[PDB]
């Protein structure tokens, strides 16, 4: 599917940065990042907080927060951007989200793509999704597939730098 000129940010997801909260041991975070039946479930409650980190500032167009049709798919999704520190569940509900999204049943299907306000996400470095309920009100929710579609923002990697022209030891 995907829109014209935009690519999935799977290659851009920093495995080091990503961390889920309430993820069950049997079905972990890595499961929901693969295009397989393997999924992620929340152990201690239906609330889940799945954060990701991108290698370089990326832009966001459409995330695909797919979920199982058993009713344990996500229902209400709160997205935050460029969080300086990891989030807390109690403080996550309080804080106002960048885009409060009410997933509809049509979205959870395998082919469903949910559109995000492209204006708000222009320099996202780390996005945290907060699943506040599942469709069936089941004890544990599930994210069948979840990835972000946008474009990469060219970032000036000062780590490389390196002189390209000139001779060393030259002053003003």
């Amino acid at each position: 599917d995907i829109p014209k000129g935009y690519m999935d940010l799977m290659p851009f997801i920093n495995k080091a940065g990503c961390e889920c909260l309430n993820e069950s041991d049997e079905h972990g975070f890595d499961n929901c990042l693969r295009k397989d039946t393997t999924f992620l479930e929340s152990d201690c409650d239906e609330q889940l907080l799945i954060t990701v980190a991108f290698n370089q500032p990326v832009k966001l167009y459409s995330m695909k927060f797919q979920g199982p049709d058993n009713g344990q798919g996500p229902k209400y999704v709160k997205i935050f951007i460029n969080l300086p520190r990891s989030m807390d569940f109690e403080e996550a509900e309080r804080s106002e989200p960048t885009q409060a999204l009410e997933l509809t049943e049509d979205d959870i299907k395998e082919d469903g793509i949910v559109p995000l306000r492209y204006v708000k996400f222009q320099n996202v470095n780390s996005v945290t999704i907060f699943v506040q309920s599942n469709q069936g009100e089941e004890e544990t929710t599930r994210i069948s597939y979840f990835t972000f579609i946008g474009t990469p923002v060219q970032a000036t990697n000062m780590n490389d730098f390196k002189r390209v022209v000139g001779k060393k030891g030259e002053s003003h």
Partner: protein, 286 residues
């Protein structure tokens, strides 16, 4: 003791930036940072600052975290960039102090013994002076009362060194008022003063009401100081002063009268000169 804590413009413009950095995404209360600056005889100069990762919890009001290594390493960099700055205190934009201030101040006492916390009310833009500077004193309260930590107050004043002054003056360059004042701005300077004196007197009344209704503790000190201000009133009704006031009011009116006359004769002379001008050109047209 620190007679003054002169906050330079750059700090309150980085704190504002610091508040925006976080509040924009991580909606949270006060943003805490470190305040660098050079010492003086007694007036602490605040010349720069930086942010320190600070997270707090409304529960128990002591589950916080002010990073040590970030504070240590940051200053490790800044003393490299500029060596006249030493850590001198902290800043938080939460308008009302917290229960966590004392404990955290003890921490910043580990980096500067005479640590002064400057509360910058970044959100408000009001009567003025968006900085409030506090110290830490532990005294026996002379007058037989429990001991405690408490934050004593230190006079705060906002000033500017030459370099920032040039930047600031241009930075406004669209709302700055004329330095001359002129009659228009001078009078507004007084409607502004009246509004304040009422506003300050109203804060005094509410507190006096609070102590009057018990909701607050009779300080027993600073309470009678307000009684000092209440005796320092002028008592203008005194005859010998009433005469002496009319003399100076009369002494000035004779100068505004002479000023008024000069401006009138000049006015008439300018109309006569102009009446000749258009009339002479009137005849000369023919």
């Amino acid at each position: 003791a620190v007679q003054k804590v002169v906050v330079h413009p750059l700090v309150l413009l980085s704190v504002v930036d610091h508040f925006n950095r976080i509040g924009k995404v991580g909606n949270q209360k006060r943003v805490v940072g470190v305040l660098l600056g050079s010492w003086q005889k007694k007036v602490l100069d605040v010349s720069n600052s930086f942010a320190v990762p600070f997270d707090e919890d409304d529960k128990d009001d002591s589950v916080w975290f002010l990073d040590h290594d970030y504070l240590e390493n940051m200053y490790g960099m800044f003393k490299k960039v500029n060596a006249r700055e030493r850590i001198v205190g902290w800043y938080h934009t939460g308008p009302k102090l917290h229960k966590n201030d004392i404990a955290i101040n003890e921490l910043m006492k580990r980096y500067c013994p005479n640590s002064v916390l400057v509360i910058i009310d970044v959100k408000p833009k009001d009567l003025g002076l968006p900085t409030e500077a506090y110290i830490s004193v532990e005294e026996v309260h002379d007058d037989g009362t429990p001991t405690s930590k408490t934050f004593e107050h230190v006079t705060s004043e906002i000033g500017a060194e030459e370099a920032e002054e040039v930047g600031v003056e241009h930075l406004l360059r669209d709302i700055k008022d004329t330095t001359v004042g002129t009659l228009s701005q001078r009078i507004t300077n007084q409607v502004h003063g009246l509004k304040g004196l009422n506003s300050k007197l109203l804060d005094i009344r509410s507190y006096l009401e609070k102590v009057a209704t018990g909701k607050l503790p009779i300080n027993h000190q600073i309470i009678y100081q307000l009684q000092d201000v209440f005796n320092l009133l002028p008592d203008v009704s005194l005859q010998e002063f009433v005469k002496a006031f009319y003399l100076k009011t009369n002494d000035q009116m004779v100068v505004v009268y002479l000023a008024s006359l000069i401006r009138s004769v000049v006015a008439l002379h300018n109309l006569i000169n102009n009446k000749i001008a258009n009339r002479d050109a009137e005849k000369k047209e023919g």
